[PDB]
Design goal:
Layout lengths: L10 H8 L7 H12 L9 H9 L2 E4 L5 E3 L4 E2 L1 E7 L2 E4 L4 E5 L4 E2 L2 H4 L2 E2 L3 E4 L4 E6 H25 L8 H9 L2 E5 L4 E3 L7 E7 L2 E5 L2 E6 L4 E2 L1 H5 L7 E4 L3 E7 H7 L3 H14 L3 H4 L3 H9 L2 E5 L4 E3 L7 E8 L2 E5 L2 E6 L4 E2 L1 H5 L7 E5 L3 E7 H8 L4 H14 L3 H4 L3 H9 L2 E5 L4 E3 L7 E7 L2 E4 L4 E5 L4 E2 L13 E4 L4 E7 H7 L2 H11 L11 E9 L2 E7 L5 E6 L2 H7 L4 H11 L8 E3 L7 E4 L6 H8 L4 H20 L2 E2 L8 E3 L5 E3 L6 E2 L16 H5 L7 H14 L12 H9 L12 H10 L16 H4 L9 H5 L16
Antiparallel strand pairs: 1-10, 2-9, 3-8, 4-7, 4-10, 5-6, 5-9, 11-18, 12-17, 13-16, 13-18, 14-15, 14-17, 19-26, 20-25, 21-24, 21-26, 22-23, 22-25, 27-34, 28-33, 29-32, 29-34, 30-31, 30-33, 35-36, 36-37, 37-39, 38-39, 40-43, 41-42
The structure holds the ligand CN(C)Cc1ccn2c(-c3ccnc(N)n3)c(-c3ccc(F)cc3)nc2c1.
InterPro entries: AGC-kinase_C, cGMP_dep_kinase, cNMP-bd_CS, cNMP-bd_dom, cNMP-bd_dom_sf, Kinase-like_dom_sf, Prot_kinase_dom, Protein_kinase_ATP_BS
Subunit structure: Monomer.
Protein name: cGMP-dependent protein kinase
Length: about 800
């Protein structure tokens, strides 16, 4: 006897009763393959993929006068008739009679939907069915196991060793699985091929001049030099048994990556250049230019590559292969091996005479960067001033205040910096005084103090006092010189105000104020309801008199839909977002959930395009360009939005966009398979269920551009049924109205609405640069957009709300 027990706690249950085991014969597999080819999502799949889906189909036995489907109840199965007959009845009235070969319940595989008509067995028959969960999981596995198999083979190949993880994953998607039956030539000797083949499963025989050299098993490959150069095949490879080979073509590689020698050399040179502290601060575009214009030469052993007289404008040297011994006059100062480099002093001092001497120890391959190579890269002959200008640029470009300014405004601010020295113990800043300067440490260390208590230390390239440029508030902490004679680059408020203009200054002024206000729930007074779904309310902060927007996500709504973990990941995405065209979060409360954000008063983008009607080229460029930068920012942070549409975009008082709904957004790490988003704006790869990445938002971008230029949606405008919207997205024809007279608009819209993500614009190694450099944006200034220097299409007269 103890004083201290706990109790324990639709369509699937109905089909479970009719289920029965049966051996999958050859005659049964043939009719499944035939009917699945007529299906909407299995048409794109190959025979090996359809053969796997045929094995997971379960056999169901029915009797004459038995209910199969119910009208209004959720749809989870898709059936293929084997024997007997099934009459379709709609609203208690007959419609059609089916037989062997036909199928029904196609929409259930893509998404959960209520059926329209009932299906009853008229005669004694049997069905071949498959569930949504089982079907979608099999597509996910076929796609995931194929990509992981292909990626493992891309790693085993030696020509792709210097490619990055992102570059390796892109060429894995370009793989095409080519099947070869016994006694079928894969490649012939003498032919000029452009394909790389790897054995996934099976055996193949080699034949140089019709003589057997060896036998190739799984893992072996051939055609590395075919992807690089136009050379003939050294042997004739023939299949001994039924082989399957993963094939990468040079034509598809040029679309995804471009010239492979250029991409590999850019990675080699970037890795070699990033070892030096000078080129560590250079941008990726600048480092690629140096690699594209570097002089690569081969030298024998014991050869003076560079001598005091025979320099020929060389400022930097990188060893690609072999070894070189560095010398100063007649004294050795080091030995550089593969990857190592030299020249930092000559790169920094353009006019300095070359005193060192480089001599090869063995046969080597050396890359050389001259002064003209550095001048064309930096875009100015004064290399010493440009490197110092880039060093300052690299520091200020990492800060929100100067990141989004135009390059002209950014260069004037960099040119306006002045250096000043501070002795030991000198107060740069004193807490309580109203400062008017922003500082960047050039050389030395400085201690941060408040009430005689050391909070932290700042060294070379660190910065402080950026708030003084936007306000006339007193300094919070004092900055004392810890080290001797510390140098500091500084810019006055007067100078900053002359460069920056009204719109951007207003955006920075009221945005940076939000981080200082300490907000608790008790002082937020509710003015009015602005949104509804889950509800958004306009709130007034009584102490600071600043107006904000407050979301109210109900806990019962999250628990009912089973979004306990997804709401936690939404908080992580929304809080980390810090971009001028994305909503800025202040603080999140809980007890139901809440999200306090900035108040966006200019109205909705949905209503803005209705007020303007069909947008023109300057108006469509502005809104799509504003969306591109917000989506590019999320793609750079490995976040996929999955729900891009004008309904989830608001306009601010200045007329600039603001992205807001991050419910469907997710931090991607590989390939996502969950079907989410709005049907009209969803991409085909989401519907097909064979994996998708950040490329889905570039499809929705094309759908937005289509609405702006043309008016209606490109796929299923009048259609309300999800199946018919999804059918128009996959099998439908993309057409354009007769009033659209611009070629560049149509060319961009067609390239953005390209079903295959490999061939879609902006889904290559270059990324959004391909969309940004398109003929549609020829006259568009991307610097002036982010810096709030363009006149927007529509400006709100006062405030607007839904
Ligand atoms: C879909 N729309 C037609 C309805 C609508 C309208 C405004 N918001 C906001 C909104 C945002 C800013 N300013 C303001 N004023 N409204 C937000 C929002 C989103 C996330 C948050 F954490 C806080 C607020 N959501 C909506 C939805």
């Amino acid at each position: 006897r103890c004083n201290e027990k706990k109790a324990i706690f639709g369509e699937d249950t109905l089909m479970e009763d009719h289920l029965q085991l049966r051996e999958k014969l050859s005659e049964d597999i043939e009719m499944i393959k035939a009917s699945l080819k007529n299906n909407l999502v299995c048409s794109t799949l190959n025979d090996n993929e359809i053969l796997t889906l045929s094995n997971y189909m379960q056999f169901f036995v029915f009797k004459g006068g038995d209910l199969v489907i119910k009208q209004g109840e959720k749809g989870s199965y898709f059936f293929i008739i084997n024997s007997g007959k099934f009459d379709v009845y709609v609203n208690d009235k007959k419609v059609k009679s089916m037989g062997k070969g036909s199928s029904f319940g196609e929409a259930a595989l893509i998404h959960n939907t209520q059926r329209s008509a009932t299906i009853m067995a008229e005669t004694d028959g049997t069905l071949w069915g498959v569930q949504r969960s089982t079907f979608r999981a099999t597509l996910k596995q076929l796609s995931n196991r194929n990509f992981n198999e292909n990626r493992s083979f891309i790693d085993s190949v030696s020509v792709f060793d210097m490619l990055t993880e992102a570059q390796k994953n892109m060429i894995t998607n370009a793989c095409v699985i080519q099947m070869f039956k016994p006694g079928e030539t894969i490649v012939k000797q003498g032919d000029y091929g452009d394909v790389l083949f790897i054995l996934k499963e099976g055996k193949a025989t080699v034949f140089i001049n019709d003589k057997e050299i060896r036998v190739l098993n799984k893992g072996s490959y051939f055609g590395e030099r075919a992807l690089l150069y136009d050379e003939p095949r050294s042997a004739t490879i023939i299949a001994k048994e039924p082989t399957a080979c993963a094939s990468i073509c040079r034509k598809l590689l040029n679309i995804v990556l471009g010239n492979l020698q250029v991409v590999l050399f850019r990675n080699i040179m970037t890795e070699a250049l990033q070892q030096s502290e000078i080129f560590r601060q250079f941008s990726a575009e600048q480092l690629n230019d140096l690699a594209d214009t570097a002089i690569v030469r081969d030298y024998p052993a014991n050869y003076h590559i560079l001598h005091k007289d025979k320099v020929k404008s060389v400022k930097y040297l990188i060893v690609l292969e072999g070894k070189v011994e560095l010398f100063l006059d007649d004294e050795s100062i080091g030995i550089l091996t593969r990857g190592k480099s030299f020249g930092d002093q000559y790169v920094l001092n353009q006019k300095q005479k070359f005193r060192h001497t480089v001599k090869s120890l063995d046969v080597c391959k050396i890359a050389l960067i001259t002064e003209s190579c550095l001048a064309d890269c930096l875009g100015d002959n004064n290399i010493d001033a440009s490197i110092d200008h880039n060093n300052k640029k690299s520091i200020i470009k990492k800060m929100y205040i100067f990141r989004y300014l135009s390059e002209q405004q950014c260069n004037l601010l960099i040119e306006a910096f002045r250096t000043t020295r501070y002795e030991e113990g000198d107060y740069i800043i004193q807490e309580g005084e109203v400062g008017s300067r922003f500082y960047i440490i050039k050389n030395g260390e400085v201690e941060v103090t408040k009430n005689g208590k050391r909070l932290r230390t700042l060294g070379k390239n660190d910065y402080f006092g950026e708030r003084a440029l936007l306000y006339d508030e007193p300094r919070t902490a004092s900055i004392i010189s810890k080290a001797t004679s510390v140098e500091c680059w500084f810019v006055d408020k007067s100078v900053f105000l002359q460069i920056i203009q009204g719109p951007m200054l207003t955006h920075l002024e009221e945005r940076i104020k939000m981080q200082d206000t300490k907000v608790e729930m008790h002082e937020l007074e509710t003015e009015r309801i602005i949104g509804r779904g889950g509800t958004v309310k306009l709130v007034h902060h009584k102490p600071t008199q600043i107006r904000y927007a407050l979301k109210c996500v109900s806990k019962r709504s999250i628990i009912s839909l089973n979004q306990q973990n997804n709401i936690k990941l939404e908080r992580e995405i929304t809080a980390e977002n810090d971009h001028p065209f994305i909503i800025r979060l202040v603080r999140t409360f809980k007890d139901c959930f809440y999200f306090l954000t900035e108040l966006v008063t200019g109205g909705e983008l949905y209503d803005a395009i209705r007020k303007l009607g069909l947008l023109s080229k300057p108006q469509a460029q502005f809104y799509l360009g504003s969306i591109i930068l917000a989506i590019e920012y999320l793609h750079e942070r490995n976040i996929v939005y999955r729900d891009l549409k004008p309904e989830n975009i608001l306009l601010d008082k200045q007329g600039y966009v603001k992205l807001i709904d991050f419910g469907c957004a997710k931090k991607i790490q590989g390939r996502a398979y969950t079907l989410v988003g709005t049907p009209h704006y969803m991409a085909p790869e989401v519907i097909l269920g064979k994996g998708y990445g950040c490329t889905v938002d570039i499809w929705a971008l094309g759908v937005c551009l289509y609405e702006f230029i043309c008016g209606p949606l490109p796929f299923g405008n009048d259609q309300e049924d999800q199946l018919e919207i999804f059918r128009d997205i996959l099998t439908g024809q993309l057409t354009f109205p007769d009033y659209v007279s611009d070629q560049d608009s149509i060319n961009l819209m067609k390239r953005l609405l390209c079903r295959l993500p490999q061939g879609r614009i902006g889904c290559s190694i270059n990324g959004f640069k391909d969309i940004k450099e398109h003929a549609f944006f020829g006259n568009f200034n991307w610097d002036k957009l982010a810096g709030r220097l363009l006149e927007p299409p529509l400006v709100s007269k006062g405030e607007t709300y839904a």
